Design an enzyme around this catalytic site. Structure first.
Site, PDB file in Angstrom:
ATOM      1  N   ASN B 112      54.339  55.965  29.092  1.00  0.00           N
ATOM      2  CA  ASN B 112      54.610  57.073  28.180  1.00  0.00           C
ATOM      3  C   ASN B 112      54.282  56.758  26.725  1.00  0.00           C
ATOM      4  OD1 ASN B 112      55.466  58.661  30.278  1.00  0.00           O
ATOM      5  ND2 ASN B 112      57.618  58.755  29.643  1.00  0.00           N
ATOM      6  N   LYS B 167      20.773  48.853  46.503  1.00  0.00           N
ATOM      7  CA  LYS B 167      20.281  49.994  45.743  1.00  0.00           C
ATOM      8  C   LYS B 167      19.243  50.719  46.594  1.00  0.00           C
ATOM      9  CE  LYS B 167      22.687  48.709  42.151  1.00  0.00           C
ATOM     10  NZ  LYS B 167      23.761  49.505  41.501  1.00  0.00           N
ATOM     11  N   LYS B 169      22.108  53.424  44.803  1.00  0.00           N
ATOM     12  CA  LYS B 169      23.560  53.511  44.848  1.00  0.00           C
ATOM     13  C   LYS B 169      24.001  54.377  46.022  1.00  0.00           C
ATOM     14  CE  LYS B 169      25.662  53.876  40.953  1.00  0.00           C
ATOM     15  NZ  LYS B 169      26.174  52.494  41.123  1.00  0.00           N
ATOM     16  N   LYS B 192      27.038  43.363  48.603  1.00  0.00           N
ATOM     17  CA  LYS B 192      28.178  44.247  48.477  1.00  0.00           C
ATOM     18  C   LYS B 192      27.704  45.662  48.537  1.00  0.00           C
ATOM     19  CE  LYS B 192      29.948  44.793  44.258  1.00  0.00           C
ATOM     20  NZ  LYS B 192      29.724  46.226  44.200  1.00  0.00           N
ATOM     21  N   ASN B 193      28.545  46.541  49.065  1.00  0.00           N
ATOM     22  CA  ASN B 193      28.364  47.968  48.875  1.00  0.00           C
ATOM     23  C   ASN B 193      28.325  48.286  47.396  1.00  0.00           C
ATOM     24  OD1 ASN B 193      30.164  48.868  51.787  1.00  0.00           O
ATOM     25  ND2 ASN B 193      28.097  49.593  51.291  1.00  0.00           N
ATOM     26  N   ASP B 194      27.398  49.144  46.986  1.00  0.00           N
ATOM     27  CA  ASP B 194      27.516  49.753  45.676  1.00  0.00           C
ATOM     28  C   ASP B 194      28.810  50.553  45.730  1.00  0.00           C
ATOM     29  OD1 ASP B 194      26.932  50.436  43.049  1.00  0.00           O
ATOM     30  OD2 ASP B 194      24.826  50.858  43.501  1.00  0.00           O
ATOM     31  N   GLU B 195      29.515  50.647  44.606  1.00  0.00           N
ATOM     32  CA  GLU B 195      30.912  51.091  44.617  1.00  0.00           C
ATOM     33  C   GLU B 195      31.209  52.432  45.324  1.00  0.00           C
ATOM     34  OE1 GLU B 195      29.253  50.477  41.611  1.00  0.00           O
ATOM     35  OE2 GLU B 195      28.765  52.560  41.121  1.00  0.00           O
ATOM     36  N   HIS B 288      36.601  45.950  42.527  1.00  0.00           N
ATOM     37  CA  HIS B 288      35.610  46.631  41.699  1.00  0.00           C
ATOM     38  C   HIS B 288      36.337  47.523  40.702  1.00  0.00           C
ATOM     39  CE1 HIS B 288      32.070  48.966  40.486  1.00  0.00           C
ATOM     40  NE2 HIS B 288      31.352  47.987  41.008  1.00  0.00           N
ATOM     41  N   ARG B 289      35.945  47.432  39.436  1.00  0.00           N
ATOM     42  CA  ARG B 289      36.702  48.035  38.342  1.00  0.00           C
ATOM     43  C   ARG B 289      36.033  49.275  37.754  1.00  0.00           C
ATOM     44  NH1 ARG B 289      35.502  43.945  33.163  1.00  0.00           N
ATOM     45  NH2 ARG B 289      33.229  44.244  33.238  1.00  0.00           N
ATOM     46  N   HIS B 322      35.316  41.868  38.950  1.00  0.00           N
ATOM     47  CA  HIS B 322      34.233  41.968  37.988  1.00  0.00           C
ATOM     48  C   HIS B 322      34.772  41.703  36.588  1.00  0.00           C
ATOM     49  CE1 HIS B 322      30.852  43.914  40.397  1.00  0.00           C
ATOM     50  NE2 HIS B 322      31.829  43.742  41.267  1.00  0.00           N
ATOM     51  N   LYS B 330      23.733  44.819  31.015  1.00  0.00           N
ATOM     52  CA  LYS B 330      23.493  46.197  30.590  1.00  0.00           C
ATOM     53  C   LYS B 330      24.751  46.888  30.076  1.00  0.00           C
ATOM     54  CE  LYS B 330      24.300  48.371  35.108  1.00  0.00           C
ATOM     55  NZ  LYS B 330      23.690  48.993  36.319  1.00  0.00           N
ATOM     56  N   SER B 369      28.189  40.898  37.218  1.00  0.00           N
ATOM     57  CA  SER B 369      27.327  41.997  37.630  1.00  0.00           C
ATOM     58  C   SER B 369      27.103  42.983  36.490  1.00  0.00           C
ATOM     59  CB  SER B 369      27.937  42.721  38.832  1.00  0.00           C
ATOM     60  OG  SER B 369      27.029  43.661  39.376  1.00  0.00           O
TER      61      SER B 369
HETATM   62  O1  LIG Z   1      60.355  59.357  29.595  1.00  0.00           O
HETATM   63  C1  LIG Z   1      60.305  60.400  28.908  1.00  0.00           C
HETATM   64  O2  LIG Z   1      60.034  60.316  27.689  1.00  0.00           O
HETATM   65  C2  LIG Z   1      60.565  61.750  29.558  1.00  0.00           C
HETATM   66  O3  LIG Z   1      61.635  61.573  30.519  1.00  0.00           O
HETATM   67  C3  LIG Z   1      61.021  62.766  28.512  1.00  0.00           C
HETATM   68  O4  LIG Z   1      62.303  62.418  28.025  1.00  0.00           O
HETATM   69  P1  LIG Z   1      63.088  63.350  26.966  1.00  0.00           P
HETATM   70  O5  LIG Z   1      63.298  64.740  27.519  1.00  0.00           O
HETATM   71  O6  LIG Z   1      64.437  62.728  26.701  1.00  0.00           O
HETATM   72  O7  LIG Z   1      62.313  63.426  25.671  1.00  0.00           O
HETATM   73  C4  LIG Z   1      59.318  62.216  30.318  1.00  0.00           C
HETATM   74  O8  LIG Z   1      59.009  61.217  31.270  1.00  0.00           O
HETATM   75  C5  LIG Z   1      58.146  62.551  29.388  1.00  0.00           C
HETATM   76  O9  LIG Z   1      58.256  63.907  29.022  1.00  0.00           O
HETATM   77  C6  LIG Z   1      56.761  62.364  30.001  1.00  0.00           C
HETATM   78  O10 LIG Z   1      55.797  62.970  29.171  1.00  0.00           O
HETATM   79  P2  LIG Z   1      54.757  64.043  29.765  1.00  0.00           P
HETATM   80  O11 LIG Z   1      55.507  65.203  30.375  1.00  0.00           O
HETATM   81  O12 LIG Z   1      53.887  64.525  28.632  1.00  0.00           O
HETATM   82  O13 LIG Z   1      53.904  63.384  30.816  1.00  0.00           O
HETATM   83  O1  LIG Z   2      26.602  50.070  40.149  1.00  0.00           O
HETATM   84  C1  LIG Z   2      26.283  49.175  39.334  1.00  0.00           C
HETATM   85  O2  LIG Z   2      25.813  49.495  38.218  1.00  0.00           O
HETATM   86  C2  LIG Z   2      26.467  47.712  39.703  1.00  0.00           C
HETATM   87  O3  LIG Z   2      26.253  47.590  41.133  1.00  0.00           O
HETATM   88  C3  LIG Z   2      25.417  46.868  38.991  1.00  0.00           C
HETATM   89  O4  LIG Z   2      24.131  47.296  39.377  1.00  0.00           O
HETATM   90  P1  LIG Z   2      22.832  46.523  38.832  1.00  0.00           P
HETATM   91  O5  LIG Z   2      22.829  45.103  39.346  1.00  0.00           O
HETATM   92  O6  LIG Z   2      21.598  47.248  39.308  1.00  0.00           O
HETATM   93  O7  LIG Z   2      22.859  46.515  37.321  1.00  0.00           O
HETATM   94  C4  LIG Z   2      27.894  47.257  39.395  1.00  0.00           C
HETATM   95  O8  LIG Z   2      28.759  48.122  40.102  1.00  0.00           O
HETATM   96  C5  LIG Z   2      28.198  47.204  37.890  1.00  0.00           C
HETATM   97  O9  LIG Z   2      27.763  45.958  37.393  1.00  0.00           O
HETATM   98  C6  LIG Z   2      29.676  47.350  37.541  1.00  0.00           C
HETATM   99  O10 LIG Z   2      29.884  46.985  36.195  1.00  0.00           O
HETATM  100  P2  LIG Z   2      31.032  45.929  35.799  1.00  0.00           P
HETATM  101  O11 LIG Z   2      30.830  44.636  36.550  1.00  0.00           O
HETATM  102  O12 LIG Z   2      30.938  45.676  34.312  1.00  0.00           O
HETATM  103  O13 LIG Z   2      32.382  46.514  36.135  1.00  0.00           O
HETATM  104 MG   LIG Z   3      27.789  48.941  41.805  1.00  0.00          MG
HETATM  105 MG   LIG Z   4      60.664  59.979  31.781  1.00  0.00          MG
END
Ligand SMILES: O=C(O)[C@@](O)(COP(=O)(O)O)[C@H](O)[C@H](O)COP(=O)(O)O
Ligand SMILES: O=C(O)[C@@](O)(COP(=O)(O)O)[C@H](O)[C@H](O)COP(=O)(O)O
Ligand SMILES: [Mg+2]
Ligand SMILES: [Mg+2]
Ligand SMILES: [Mg+2]
Lengths: 455, 455, 160
Positions: B112, B167, B169, B192-195, B288-289, B322, B330, B369
């Site tokens: 929050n 490739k 993808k 690896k699988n491309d993502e 994979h991120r 990764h 790149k 990568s």
């Molecule tokens: O933790 C908190 O802050 C709350 O319980 C609000 O408390 P209060 O009522 O006491 O202010 C909710 O989780 C937020 O509203 C989430 O925001 P949103 O709805 O924008 O995702």
């Molecule tokens: O889909 C792609 O682009 C890749 O397979 C790279 O391909 P290439 O080898 O052809 O460049 C990877 O998923 C990325 O590197 C992810 O980036 P990161 O590792 O920064 O999360």
């Molecule tokens: Mg990939």
């Molecule tokens: Mg809350």
């Protein structure tokens, strides 16, 4: 390398892409990084990294591959606008039931493209999903319809559900926790775990659930009114989520349908939401979006907007999702965010770029929360236009000078005031709890109602 | 409202908080919005929304609650630095096994507080986890040790794993997909699988897996060397992930330990990563991120850095994650990102703010990568200091002029060159595939080694 | 899981963390739930590790769930008294795979934040490799304690 010729076709018409029903459309606000290609070249590489290509041509590419390329079909460098059409064949499907997964939509449309070195920033503001892809999503299985039914309200436009969050966020032991629950329920309907509340060592999960279950029975027996609770069942482990959910329903027994399940869907991920959605389809799925602000904030030029998150949540099957206070509360948000609510409640609605037909997919409730209290409510409803929703006020209820029960009633009376079209200050004369909210939060009262003291 | 007295204690000492072992420490780069409280007031409110409090006082607060307050213990308005200590009792634990969940860590420390209206932006750069909390996390169950063992390499410093991404993808049908796998494996180790690759309608999951298994058997029989594959099993549905994983292991049979499972951990969420980690602890968990760039990019002042993401992944139990190309590829990244690798590989390492003892928790492999090729590898290894890792080059391998097989060997020879400490241009004279990589990517060759053609 | 994970729980170095002082609750059988737990408390005031004697489980005079709860109480009391972490190795041996799961799951849930203080004992020789693998694969994050009761029928030098 310039990939415009392959991954960009501005001769394509949006109306025809939509009419075709074979493409997911995504609208981005994008600006290329300085020292690389121009707008269309960058948009082309963007589309490549989001579908079939990489940063260089590969020999393994064939014509069938080109057929499913994502295509840039509309650009406006002046407004930094970029629209891309994704053939629906790209998106992954479940082996087990042939249904869609939002994880695949995310991986392609806002995945690797957020880490491009030749891009300064890119953020999705809207997307369109055609029928052939839309009907493959779970959608909500439970809606406010089912909560209204438990409360004895009409199942159509059943009205405002008075809610709160148990505060402190953490620190209450099981019985003090349950005591606050009993107090609020004397005047309110709905209570939710604050998002991190679960199985802390000082408040064991099962002890808390039992204590709250006891409080619900006592409150209901006392008031003769049905009461609801939304339990956080968020976890890394799928089986922990099941264990928590199954225990809650068994413990509440004949009050089991009074239970909603809360999932921290943004930090825990779609996987957690789907665990809840599919394991407990008959229980209201409460989507809490804690952490979303890291990308949804207008201060961020990356990721996606709150509007996109909310639209996705409906496909994922959230019974309700937090949409914010639309500028009337403590969190970042604007009055125009009302459009988000309409997009998740209506069968047809307009986004910032795309009109979306939902084809009878169940609605997702706008859950209003964040620094709300009785004083700020009339203004919020004026901007939204209705109160058929859940509003939770933690501080607004338990911060009431006369306690949680009075706090609950102030929220109730605040909404009664708005539909009555009455003057809040004039309304306060005949409704004590609402009047006492002025004294509970004098700074808000002074700014909203400059001369409330004289009356 | 000013909550400084309660939620801020700058007299606290970091060395003592660490020595205490009762607090998670988090270091943020935060800037208050204009028109609200000052820095310490805002930081105090930040801690409140991140632990026990809300934006107003509540009657339900007791002394026990104050005991678990998150405390601002160090600030630097000049550098916009803010350090907060979270008592470890705040964080949720599994009812089923009493273990920790990263989801709770996320909800509190970066939940929050990312949506606060009085904050312009806030982003976590580092966090510290004490022993009592650290040992409650899964950690990795499989490491590169297990891949080295399968390849017949030494289990200590087994060396470089030549890898690639299939490739295009998306777009390859089952057999053309498997053919590309066979080709690369003639010279490489890892695929690896491309993502986003999974169960597309034009490339059914079960058909593709069977074809790849055939390719592995043919390639291994042809070369007499072991080959590895990392299958994407990401899904919204936990049970879809199980189904994919189970089918793969059963299909590959006696080559089952040659299989890694890839998870799009950022978009699918921690829940998805844990599904794989706990269901398949004996299979290398490939994190994979995709999508991380939405917050991790230096262009973003919200969320958390790639360093934080990677450190969390190790706790989550990623066998490898990764870490980026560290400015040599790149994607967005800097040379200083080497510190990220050391943090997830070593038993003791320094973050930008905190020193972390890992207590023998298994390491997470840095997976390199993103726009890498044979030409760019020597420079990368110079910056890192070792090659005990997995590097996957999609375009770098299948973009090779002589095909994927030649592409694989160029990556192999590129690392052998660095290991021998020889001059790449001189080394290329006796190694064709490496030499042919110069012609495959002349712009990279021209920029890195200006006069390569004459020799 | 290795001794390293027990050392970590004891707050010892994860490399050469040293000697783990242990005992077996005696009598082998006969102690009812609370007297059992009392003996556990007593030993833990000076020791680290306690294991079920190999046949201890769900005897009619000492029901499994009652004993586990009483021991969990003893661990918490001992740890609060000594300020030191304490370990227990529970016998979860059974013919039925699902009985083994049930025992393991109940123990971990019962001990909660002390769940990583728990080892699982299996009479691996008489119950067989199948039982050892049940524990190894169902509870890979819990120290698997292999008890070899009955092994002497073949392992003895008297046996050829
Ligand atoms: O933790 C908190 O802050 C709350 O319980 C609000 O408390 P209060 O009522 O006491 O202010 C909710 O989780 C937020 O509203 C989430 O925001 P949103 O709805 O924008 O995702
Ligand atoms: O889909 C792609 O682009 C890749 O397979 C790279 O391909 P290439 O080898 O052809 O460049 C990877 O998923 C990325 O590197 C992810 O980036 P990161 O590792 O920064 O999360
Ligand atoms: Mg990939
Ligand atoms: Mg809350
Ligand atoms: Mg014995």
């Amino acid at each position: 390398m310039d990939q415009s010729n392959r991954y960009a076709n501005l001769n394509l018409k949006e109306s025809e892409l939509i009419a075709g029903g074979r493409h997911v459309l995504c609208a981005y606000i994008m600006k290329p990084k300085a020292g690389f290609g121009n707008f269309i070249q960058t948009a082309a590489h963007f589309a490549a990294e989001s579908s079939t290509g990489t940063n260089v041509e590969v020999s393994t590419t064939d014509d069938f591959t080109r057929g499913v390329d994502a295509l840039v079909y509309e650009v406006d460098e002046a407004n930094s606008l970029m629209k891309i059409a994704y053939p629906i064949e790209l998106f992954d499907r479940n082996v087990i039931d042939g249904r869609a997964m939002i994880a695949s939509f995310l991986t392609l449309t806002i995945g690797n493209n957020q880490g491009m070195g030749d891009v300064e920033y890119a953020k999705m503001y809207d997307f369109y999903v055609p029928p052939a892809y839309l009907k493959l999503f779970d959608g909500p299985s439970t809606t406010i319809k089912d909560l209204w039914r438990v409360l004895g309200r009409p199942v159509i436009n059943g009205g405002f559900i008075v809610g709160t969050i148990i505060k402190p966020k953490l620190g209450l032991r099981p019985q003090p926790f349950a005591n606050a629950c009993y107090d609020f329920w004397l005047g309110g309907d709905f209570i939710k775990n604050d998002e991190p509340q679960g199985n802390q060592v000082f408040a064991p999960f099962k002890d808390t659930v039992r204590a709250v279950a006891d409080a619900m029975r006592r409150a209901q027996d006392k008031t003769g009114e049905a009461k609801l609770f939304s339990f956080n069942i968020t976890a890394d482990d799928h089986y922990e989520m099941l264990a928590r959910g199954e225990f809650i329903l068994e413990t509440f027994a004949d009050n089991a349908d009074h239970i909603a399940f809360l999932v921290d869907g943004y930090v825990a991920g779609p996987a957690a939401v789907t665990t809840a959605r599919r394991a407990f389809p008959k229980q209201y799925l409460h989507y809490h979006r804690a952490g979303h602000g890291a990308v949804t904030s207008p201060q961020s030029k990356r990721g996606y907007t709150a509007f996109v998150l909310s639209k996705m949540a409906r496909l994922q099957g959230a019974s309700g999702i937090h949409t914010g206070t639309m500028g009337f509360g403590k969190a970042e948000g604007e009055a125009a965010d009302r459009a988000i609510a309409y997009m998740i409640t209506e069968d047809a609605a307009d986004g910032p770029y795309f009109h979306q037909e939902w084809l009878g997919m169940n609605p997702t409730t706008p859950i209003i929360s964040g620094g709300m209290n009785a004083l700020r409510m009339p203004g919020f409803f004026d901007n939204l236009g209705h109160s058929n929703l859940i509003m939770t006020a933690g501080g607004g209820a338990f911060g009431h000078v006369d306690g949680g029960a009075a706090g609950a009633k102030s929220l109730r009376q605040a909404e009664q005031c708005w539909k009555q079209g009455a003057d809040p200050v004039e309304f306060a004369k005949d409704h004590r709890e609402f009047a006492r909210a002025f004294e509970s939060f004098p700074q808000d009262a002074d700014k909203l109602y400059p001369n409330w003291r004289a009356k």
